[PDB]
Design a protein around this ligand. Structure first.
Ligand SMILES: [Ca+2]
Ligand SMILES: [Ca+2]
Ligand SMILES: [Ca+2]
Ligand SMILES: [Ca+2]
Ligand SMILES: [Ca+2]
Lengths: 65, 66
């Protein structure tokens, strides 16, 4: 579905997680100038279970906002 | 030693997710009074981040420190 496809676009190495670096790429491509350190905090906020990675369920939870 | 490296990793990994972010390294350097700009902090972090995921794990921390 559309959420699955968007997750796949943001997951560059295809390991099922969106990393901080992959989130930086997302924000760059959205034309949102964010510093690396700011993206770090956005990544942390998205990482509900605190394993340091954004999985698909966490991506969906944020996209539902 | 492993015990000292683990202690230092835990100090830097404030949010406890198993990684040190550039934002966490910024906090580390400011708390130490290290005269580094944000760009310099972010550059050090990029140099430490061997695998490029934007996140410094314990292995990469040890590699930089040893
Ligand atoms: Ca992909
Ligand atoms: Ca990935
Ligand atoms: Ca997670
Ligand atoms: Ca951390
Ligand atoms: Ca890394």
């Amino acid at each position: 579905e559309e959420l699955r496809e968007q997750f796949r676009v943001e997951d560059k190495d295809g390991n099922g997680y969106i990393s901080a670096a992959e989130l930086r790429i997302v924000m760059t491509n959205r034309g949102e100038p964010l510093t690396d350190e700011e993206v770090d905090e956005l990544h942390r906020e998205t990482d509900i279970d605190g394993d340091g990675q954004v999985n698909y369920e966490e991506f969906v939870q944020r996209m539902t906002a």
